[PDB]
Design a protein around this nucleic acid. Structure first.
Ligand code: K
Ligand code: K
Ligand code: K
Ligand code: K
Ligand code: K
Ligand code: K
Ligand code: K
Ligand code: K
Ligand code: K
Ligand code: K
Ligand code: K
Ligand code: K
Ligand code: K
Ligand code: K
Ligand code: K
Ligand code: K
Ligand code: K
Ligand code: K
Ligand code: K
Ligand code: K
Ligand code: K
Ligand code: K
Ligand code: K
Ligand code: K
Ligand code: K
Ligand code: K
Ligand code: K
Ligand code: K
Ligand code: K
Ligand code: K
Ligand code: K
Ligand code: K
Ligand code: K
Ligand code: K
Ligand code: K
Ligand code: K
Ligand code: K
Ligand code: K
Ligand code: K
Ligand code: K
Ligand code: K
Ligand code: K
Ligand code: K
Ligand code: K
Ligand code: MG
Ligand code: MG
Ligand code: MG
Ligand code: MG
Ligand code: MG
Ligand code: MG
Ligand code: MG
Ligand code: MG
Ligand code: MG
Ligand code: MG
Ligand code: MG
Ligand code: MG
Ligand code: MG
Ligand code: MG
Ligand code: MG
Ligand code: MG
Ligand code: MG
Ligand code: MG
Ligand code: MG
Ligand code: MG
Ligand code: MG
Ligand code: MG
Ligand code: MG
Ligand code: MG
Ligand code: MG
Ligand code: MG
Ligand code: MG
Ligand code: MG
Ligand code: MG
Ligand code: MG
Ligand code: MG
Ligand code: ZN
Ligand code: ZN
Lengths: 104, 245, 112, 87, 51
RNA sequence: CCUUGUUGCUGUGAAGGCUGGCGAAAGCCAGCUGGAGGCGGCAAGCCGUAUUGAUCUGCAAAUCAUUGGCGUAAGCAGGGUA
RNA sequence: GAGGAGGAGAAGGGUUUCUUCUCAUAAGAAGAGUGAGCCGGGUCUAAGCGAGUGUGUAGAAGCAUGAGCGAAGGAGAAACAGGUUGAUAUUCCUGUGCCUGUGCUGUCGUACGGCAACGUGUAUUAGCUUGUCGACACGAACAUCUAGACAAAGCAGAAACACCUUUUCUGUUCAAGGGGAAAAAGACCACUGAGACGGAUCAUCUGGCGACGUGGUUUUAUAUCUGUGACCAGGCCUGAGCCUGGUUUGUUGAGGAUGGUCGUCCAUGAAAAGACAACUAUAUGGCAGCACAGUCCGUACCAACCGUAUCAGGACUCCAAGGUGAAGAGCCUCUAGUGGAUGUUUUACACAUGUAAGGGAAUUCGGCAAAAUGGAUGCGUAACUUCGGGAGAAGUAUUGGUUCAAUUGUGAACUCAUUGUGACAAGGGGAAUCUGACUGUUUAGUAAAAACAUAGCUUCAUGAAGAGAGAUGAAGUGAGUUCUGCCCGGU
RNA sequence: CCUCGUCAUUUAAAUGGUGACGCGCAUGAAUGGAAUGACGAGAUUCCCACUGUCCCUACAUGUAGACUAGCGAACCCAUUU
């Protein structure tokens, strides 16, 4: 079985130096570089990952279409559907108590 | 001879580092506030947990650190200064709190930010209010009684993390982790096991001190080792304390 | 601020003053180019890849070399690569926008 | 479970360290690992994150507590005194 | 090795041009009295201290 | 002190869990599941007990052979800093 | 013998690399050789260092604040195949691309859908504020993918043939970019309304703060296709070009990658540059073609490094085939790489090793050295103990080849001239006493220990803090069990 | 210290080992005293197995060594021995 050399950079096996083995049209087995995985947004209240948005690294994320980075609601990314339902209710119910305390 | 271990470890390059610190711990300065508890966190060198608070100063949001009392939670609203209610975790002027109550983080003079009771499991007791002089007597966890003016502030509860000294450290590595952030030498080599160039207890054909271990308060610094200015020694019973408020 | 500058790539440092009289023509096309190189190594590059090779002044850069060629010899340039050699000479390689013209310019200039 | 007569959770240590010390450690070690009841949601899902900080695995609330138990003896008493002050 | 600074490279370039014998025509000149160039070096016998 | 790299094969089988039996109760006995430990035998490595072996104009101004001690960790190591 | 005497990088060296000639040879002389927007430096900040200014000094040192600096292995926009030289190549040549900006010409835009979970639409600058990304310990088990390795069939070429053999060997390829599933694992939305009870994992567990069920919404790989043909094998001719193949299935599987769980801690495991969303204003903005731009420095070679040398020493990392076996152990082979002070059968004494009648420590300060035991399976296991251990205690038996049953428990028969963990690998065991509780550490180069450390125990001083008595420092004794008597005359 | 203390056991035979005894030259309580378990490349005595350690030595192998080609030193030295 054919064995590999490091084509570029350092041999020292840090997080930025992941590699995989690949077979070429010329029938050689060579190392090729790998980019790191990405984490997408977590909710600002509960720590849950937001639905409807992609996971990518900051530079690659910025080059995608805006639709990959939001949902069409009051808080776009930012917060999940349950947390917005709570926020909408809370603001309403507080105003009604103040209404009563003003009228009485 | 040469300089002893006790002096070398007091030089500046040996002082504790602050790079992992969260900030300076202490009360806000304002006459009244409403605060929210944002997070409860561990800080690398300290066994009692810290609480991050958020309060408005002018229009702007500002952040502070308190030591956590037991029974707060993330999201709780707390009331600071004059006109706060007697509820667990509020901060109040000392003259408002009834006798026999337990308090933490007491200011020694107004607006100092809180000193006194700050270690896990500790509290102070309010023992007397004097309506003429506007003084209050507090009993500290050493047993000492001290007088503070009624305008000083204090936190209502016991400091979190009590009970920690119940579990013995059975192994050498467990002690290693505890002393890694402190200033004391660990492991500690005994002075009688050194040569006379290194320590006043060194040397001789048997391991012994050879001279009395009780030393004067006014002795020169590079030989002030042993029991410094001891009033008595040994395992026998002492005498009655004298007490005034 | 003063520092030993041992890791730096540019050996100059100081900003330069004005002067009462200034030198006539300045750093200019006929100071930039030294000579074209014609030997068995260079000949292949003219015949196969439409590129000439030249020795250039130490103070020169890619943009200056591009201008100077279009001024002295007259053909239009696609690319310039540069190489500092172990013998203390900066070499430049110039590829022309049309091949074939490389053999015309080389022969007129007596390089080949 | 409970395959040993006396040694309990301290069986991990074999014949090393003293007998008397192990039976003090045991109290704390059994207390640390248990799940406890949540005040906010009623479920038995509370566990220790770090000394002094306790946390619910369902609803996410964090609360200050003791080193080896969520509520200490001094707290159970003092909490009552405050409720009387409010009267 | 392959990685070098600009300052180290110029030291090597200069150390390499100086390392040459007396040219063979000079020996014929009436006034010339040198036998061998005593400043010649070998990589096996001395260090440059370019570091 | 700051930023990093480096755990392969095997033995024993703690806490917690499920079935079946015994008991008025409290809680006892089997079989299985689970995988803790500055815990055992080894590998790569790190070390330096014995032969008072070889060598002592040495391969070497401290090395070599066989034999040994630890090896899931108060373990070993590069660079930056004090 | 794939934890290589193989193929490559770093630190260190500096032309030692390639061609020609000459011996002068680990020797010289003369030439030639290192090409980048996409690889690394120049950027950000760690621990930390610091010009100037203030205070101080005869001048200094020191102390307060602080521009600038601080990682070729931490963070950090964008490239891959195939060819070419005597010597360079993700840098040159051909092909297909991508990032950041600039300009021309066309062509469209100023909004909607779903009960909802959310979708359709490549969208401008600017600003508050709130949040996210960058951005992170160790250990264990379980899934899924990819390299790799096997076995059948097909074809092409090889090896072997006194005999036998469809026996044996080598091949059967597909990059970045573009398009794209089923699957598995989790979140969530609508209807529904469940218990002394259902659901679910290898293991924990889970439900009126909404179970099972029936329909959906979304996040995370990979296979497959295109990449316009290159490349490989074979045949025919040849100082050149033609022709034919590159087809199918099963088993296994990382020392690489990823996912959601679980455990441990008086230990809870970096920053910043640079980004993004929501909200508010404001709008000539999106896409396709064509064109232009992207500076400066490093790039050869190492078996050539440090030890006065062509020195059995020392010296940071990466990739890794088949058999035997639990096992990158030892032993044997494939790919790739390798070697000289000459002849002589050469006494004695040596240094590395073999074997030995009868006796069995009589030897010697002393069983020092050597021998003996050794893996797996079963039977059987004492005193004492902190009840965990002692414990592989001790003591005993079995083991190869063949042909069968039975399906993980294993049985049975036949066979051999010394018997079978056959080579290689691989514990000697028991009874007592002194001493240190244990793992750990030490006199680099004559001492590894009973010495040091350690957990635990006791005493002392303090309300001063960027630290606040469950704290911060100073001493002594040495885990646990059981005890710790008397003396304040001297110092 | 006297000292190879006296008595018992282990051997054919014990300046040794273990068990007892005690006016102990000069034992002794955190200058820590006493009795055990698990663990030591720690010090010491005995038994079983095993053997060229020994009685008492013999034979054989590899590499050096003797002789031969090529290459080629040093310590030391009043020297007549
Ligand atoms: K979306
Ligand atoms: K310390
Ligand atoms: K000493
Ligand atoms: K002494
Ligand atoms: K002592
Ligand atoms: K004395
Ligand atoms: K270098
Ligand atoms: K050199
Ligand atoms: K285990
Ligand atoms: K020796
Ligand atoms: K040699
Ligand atoms: K071999
Ligand atoms: K990091
Ligand atoms: K090109
Ligand atoms: K085949
Ligand atoms: K690895
Ligand atoms: K290169
Ligand atoms: K193998
Ligand atoms: K196997
Ligand atoms: K292997
Ligand atoms: K093997
Ligand atoms: K003997
Ligand atoms: K003797
Ligand atoms: K000996
Ligand atoms: K008992
Ligand atoms: K035993
Ligand atoms: K056996
Ligand atoms: K062997
Ligand atoms: K020890
Ligand atoms: K160990
Ligand atoms: K040792
Ligand atoms: K003492
Ligand atoms: K101590
Ligand atoms: K004791
Ligand atoms: K006295
Ligand atoms: K006295
Ligand atoms: K005797
Ligand atoms: K005797
Ligand atoms: K005495
Ligand atoms: K005494
Ligand atoms: K005493
Ligand atoms: K030892
Ligand atoms: K012989
Ligand atoms: K010879
Ligand atoms: Mg002294
Ligand atoms: Mg002592
Ligand atoms: Mg370049
Ligand atoms: Mg592991
Ligand atoms: Mg171990
Ligand atoms: Mg080994
Ligand atoms: Mg050492
Ligand atoms: Mg010795
Ligand atoms: Mg091997
Ligand atoms: Mg080897
Ligand atoms: Mg050469
Ligand atoms: Mg780059
Ligand atoms: Mg910088
Ligand atoms: Mg980096
Ligand atoms: Mg090359
Ligand atoms: Mg790419
Ligand atoms: Mg190269
Ligand atoms: Mg014999
Ligand atoms: Mg015999
Ligand atoms: Mg004798
Ligand atoms: Mg021996
Ligand atoms: Mg005894
Ligand atoms: Mg040890
Ligand atoms: Mg030594
Ligand atoms: Mg030694
Ligand atoms: Mg000691
Ligand atoms: Mg004790
Ligand atoms: Mg007791
Ligand atoms: Mg004897
Ligand atoms: Mg005796
Ligand atoms: Mg004594
Ligand atoms: Zn949320
Ligand atoms: Zn809860």
């Amino acid at each position: 079985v054919e064995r590999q050399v490091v084509r570029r950079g350092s041999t020292f096996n840090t997080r930025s130096n992941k590699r995989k083995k690949v077979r070429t049209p010329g029938n050689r087995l060579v190392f090729q570089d790998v980019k790191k995985k990405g984490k997408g947004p977590k909710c600002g209240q509960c720590g849950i990952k937001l639905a409807g948005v992609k996971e990518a690294r900051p530079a690659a994320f910025s080059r995608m279409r805006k639709s990959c980075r939001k949902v069409n609601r009051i808080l776009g990314g930012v917060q999940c559907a349950k947390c917005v339902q709570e926020k909408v209710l809370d603001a309403f119910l507080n105003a009604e108590e103040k209404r009563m305390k003003e009228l009485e | 001879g040469k300089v002893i271990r006790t002096l070398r470890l007091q030089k500046e390059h040996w002082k504790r580092k602050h790079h992992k610190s969260k900030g300076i711990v202490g009360f806000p300065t304002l006459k009244n506030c409403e605060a929210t508890v944002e997070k409860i966190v561990h800080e690398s060198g300290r066994p009692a947990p810290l609480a991050i608070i958020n309060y408005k100063k002018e229009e702007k949001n500002t952040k502070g650190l308190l030591v956590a009392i037991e029974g707060i939670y993330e999201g709780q609203k707390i009331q600071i200064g004059e006109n706060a209610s007697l509820e667990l975790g509020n901060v109040c002027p000392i003259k408002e709190i009834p006798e026999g109550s337990l308090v933490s983080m007491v200011e020694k003079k107004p607006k100092d930010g809180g000193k006194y009771v700050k270690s896990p499991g500790c509290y102070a007791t309010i023992v007397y209010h004097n309506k003429l002089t506007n003084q209050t007597t507090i009993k500290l966890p050493s047993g000492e009684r001290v007088r503070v003016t009624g305008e000083s502030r204090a936190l209502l509860g016991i400091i979190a993390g009590g009970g920690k000294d119940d579990k013995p450290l059975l192994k050498a590595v467990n002690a290693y982790y505890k002393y890694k952030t402190k200033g004391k030498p660990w492991p500690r080599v005994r002075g009688v096991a050194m040569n006379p160039v290194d320590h006043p207890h060194g040397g001789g054909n048997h391991q012994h001190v050879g001279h009395p271990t009780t030393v004067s308060r006014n002795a020169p610094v590079n030989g002030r080792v042993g029991l410094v200015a001891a009033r008595r020694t040994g395992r026998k019973k002492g005498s009655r304390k004298i007490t005034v408020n | 601020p003063k520092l030993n500058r041992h890791k730096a790539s540019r050996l100059d440092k100081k900003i330069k003053q004005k002067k009462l009289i200034e030198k006539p023509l300045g750093f200019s096309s006929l100071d930039i180019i030294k000579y074209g190189i014609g030997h068995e190594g260079a000949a292949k590059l003219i015949e196969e890849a439409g590129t000439l090779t030249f020795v250039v002044d130490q103070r020169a850069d890619k943009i200056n070399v591009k201008k100077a060629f279009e001024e002295i010899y007259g053909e239009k340039v696609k690319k310039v690569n540069i190489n500092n050699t172990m013998k203390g000479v900066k070499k430049a390689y110039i590829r022309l926008v049309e091949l074939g013209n490389a053999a015309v310019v080389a022969t007129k200039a007596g390089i080949l | 479970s409970r395959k040993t007569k006396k040694v309990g959770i301290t069986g991990k240590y074999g014949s090393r360290y003293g007998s008397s010390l192990k039976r003090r450690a045991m109290i704390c070690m059994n207390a640390q690992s248990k799940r406890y009841c949540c005040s906010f949601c009623g479920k038995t899902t509370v566990k220790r994150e770090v000394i002094g900080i306790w946390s619910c695995r369902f609803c996410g609330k964090k609360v200050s507590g003791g080193a080896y138990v969520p509520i200490t003896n001094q707290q159970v008493e003092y909490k009552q005194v405050i409720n009387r002050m409010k009267m | 090795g392959s990685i070098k600074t600009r300052r180290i490279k110029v030291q090597l370039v200069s150390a390499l041009k100086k390392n040459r014998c007396i040219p063979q025509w000079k020996r014929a000149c009436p006034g010339f009295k040198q036998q061998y160039n005593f400043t010649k070096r070998s990589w096996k016998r001395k260090t440059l201290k370019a570091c």
